[PDB]
């Protein structure tokens, strides 16, 4: 019964591929030929937030566009002030190997997760001023690779368990588990309406999840190596992926296939972080070649370069108003660009 | 008024930076060790003696120097991604079960995972302290002669014991071949890539061996000294 069901799977995959090709009547490289290029995006480091002792693995902006959280392998969860390069909180973690961190859109809480298979929620706006663990969301049998705060006490955590999860922080038990990925789920990106999220894994595939229902609404193939980063288009109708393939692909939730491929022949290094600008016109991609490239999200041309990091660029982040681009790296320095 | 709140920000920053200095003095003083191994590779015993005799986290202290050992547990067997977390680690302690049988070539499985650690472009400066475990269970296997490594390694029959051999009392020539032949299968990978950046310090241990906590301390001094000696280009 296995061979016949494998036959069913292969013919249904071929049917989906033909239905995608029937929808593939053009590309952005043909429609955006009448689109003027953005020129050279020459962004300069405005601030260098230093104080971290080890590699900076994660970084996330607050909704106010002032406060960052940066997670580093030394066991620190530092809250920065991006305008005055001042540290607001230095949260020591129980596990030094923190692989992700998130800043709650309400500003009250901050998460972090790594090799301890636990997503720890810290309460910043506490009655005594002591930044203390609020919850420890245990239950994953794999390392925590990316956790994103949903609004109403919910958090979408992605693990190396090949399984995502939506946790109810107040109780501490996950209400939904998103399964279907065969490789380590590496990165998340919540849509602007926080009703759908997309997951990147080491299966070279991206999956569109319904966070309220728990089903994989859509599986995006086309990448060739481990999806290391994922990010939504600002309108929530498209998303960009970065992999070890050394290319960025732009999938559309409606077109159900690739829109653009962001690659360069002199680029052979894996892409660790991907972001978008407020208009979604600039695709910021962090690389292993120690610099970020400012891709034209509509033309696949390298409009600029954010160079100046002495090690691998591990985490990118655009402010919610788009006023700056933060780039954390394994050199323990988080640089703000504009 | 904003002057008072901005100076309170400065004062909180000063407190935070004083705490970060006090924490960095402990960070760069403790040595981080990633403890890897295959399935039932005998590394569990190595955890016990480094824990009691003076992922999961192990802090021990030998010669007043603090060491942190991180046994990666409750993780899958796809070490592709979280092994990038271990670049600041001074030494990846690789425990190989030299006599895993008497499932399916656990030595070649460990050899290929060993080959992928050096060639990993992020572990291209992390040294590997190699504990070839179960040297006592490898003894009874080869001197009996019913289960050979020659069927898993044809180049063993054409392999003669090296001149750098230091056999323990009771190590007949039939075992010091298998003892040292395995060591040179790992050194064939340790020398064919990345010279001067990382170094392999292979060791022969067993469940009855107790100074394994000093072999890592002696070779973590060697790792740090070689890291300093190449900062001055003296090495």
């Amino acid at each position: 019964e296995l061979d016949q069901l494998r036959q069913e799977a292969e013919q249904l995959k071929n049917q989906i591929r033909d239905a995608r090709k029937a929808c593939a009547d053009a590309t952005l490289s043909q429609i955006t030929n009448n689109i003027d290029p953005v020129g050279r995006i020459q962004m300069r480091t405005r601030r260098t937030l230093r104080g971290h002792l080890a590699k900076i693995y994660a970084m996330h902006w607050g909704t106010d566009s002032r406060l960052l959280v940066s997670a580093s392998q030394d066991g620190k969860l530092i809250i920065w002030d991006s305008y005055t390069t001042n540290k607001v909180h230095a949260i020591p973690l129980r596990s030094s190997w923190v692989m992700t961190c998130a800043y709650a859109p309400s500003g009250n809480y901050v998460a972090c997760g790594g090799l301890d298979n636990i997503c720890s929620i810290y309460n910043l706006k506490t009655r005594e001023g002591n930044v203390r663990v609020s919850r420890e969301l245990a239950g994953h049998t794999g390392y925590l690779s990316c956790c994103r705060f949903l609004d109403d006490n919910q958090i979408v955590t992605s693990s190396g368990d090949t399984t995502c999860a939506l946790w109810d922080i107040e109780t501490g038990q996950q209400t939904t588990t998103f399964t279907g990925h065969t490789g380590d789920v590496m990165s998340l990106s919540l849509a602007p309406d926080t009703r759908l999220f997309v997951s990147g894994a080491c299966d070279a595939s991206a999956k569109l999840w319904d966070v309220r229902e728990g089903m994989c609404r859509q599986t995006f193939t086309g990448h060739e190596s481990d999806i290391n980063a994922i990010c939504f288009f600002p309108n929530g109708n498209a998303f960009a992926t970065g992999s070890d393939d050394a290319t960025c692909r732009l999938f559309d939730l409606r077109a159900d296939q690739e829109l653009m491929t962001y690659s360069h022949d002199n680029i052979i290094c894996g892409i660790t972080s991907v972001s978008f600008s407020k208009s979604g016109r600039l695709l910021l991609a962090g690389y292993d070649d120690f610099n970020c490239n400012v891709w034209d999200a509509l033309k696949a041309d390298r409009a600029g370069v954010l160079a100046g990091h002495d090690n691998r660029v591990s985490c990118l982040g655009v402010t919610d108003d788009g006023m700056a681009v933060a780039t954390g790296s394994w050199d323990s320095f988080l640089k703000i660009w504009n | 008024d904003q002057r008072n709140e901005e100076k309170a920000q400065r004062e909180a920053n000063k407190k935070i930076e004083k705490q970060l200095q006090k924490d960095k003095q402990v960070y760069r003083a403790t040595h981080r060790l990633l403890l890897l191994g295959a399935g039932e590779s005998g590394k569990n015993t190595i955890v016990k003696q480094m824990r009691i005799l003076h992922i999961f986290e192990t802090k021990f202290q030998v010669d007043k120097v603090n060491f942190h050992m991180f046994d990666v547990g409750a993780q899958r067997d796809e070490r592709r991604k979280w092994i990038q977390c271990f670049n600041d680690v001074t030494a990846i302690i690789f425990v190989v079960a030299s006599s895993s049988y008497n499932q399916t070539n656990r030595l070649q499985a460990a050899l290929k995972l060993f080959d992928s650690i050096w060639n990993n472009k992020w572990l291209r400066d992390t040294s590997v302290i190699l504990f070839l475990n179960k040297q006592d269970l490898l003894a009874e296997k080869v001197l009996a002669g019913k289960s050979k490594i020659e069927d898993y390694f044809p180049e063993f029959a054409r392999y003669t014991t090296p001149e750098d051999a230091t056999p323990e009392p009771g190590e007949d020539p039939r075992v010091t071949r298998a003892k040292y032949f395995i060591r040179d299968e790992f050194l064939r990978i340790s020398t064919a890539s990345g010279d001067g950046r990382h170094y392999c310090y292979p060791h022969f241990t067993c469940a009855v061996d107790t100074e394994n906590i000093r072999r890592v301390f002696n070779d973590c001094r060697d790792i740090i000294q070689r890291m300093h000696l190449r900062q001055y280009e003296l090495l």
Partner: nanobody
Amino acid sequence: QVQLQESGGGLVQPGGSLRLSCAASGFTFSNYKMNWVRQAPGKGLEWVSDISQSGASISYTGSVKGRFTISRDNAKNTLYLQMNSLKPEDTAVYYCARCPAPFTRDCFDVTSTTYAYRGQGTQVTV
């Protein structure tokens, strides 16, 4: 879509010869290191033989050296495993796998239990 379907297996008598063709599709074949793994009855995934991007550096598991030989055709995006002088121990489902990242000497997790870029395997019974 990284698709790795394989053919050429089947039943052969001890001492025979077999050639498994690994038709790779969905990833530029010349960019990434390739290898064969096999799962003998008894629940064990073992690596068989490595081959670099250009096909210059070829390694083998000890039990199959000198009797197994692999080539790669970067033009047709195919990988071969010529299996000479087979033994009844060689009974296994042979999976054609590629390592996870191009331009890397490291070959991670090809022998993992649930690897993503590993073929569906062909059964070779001796």
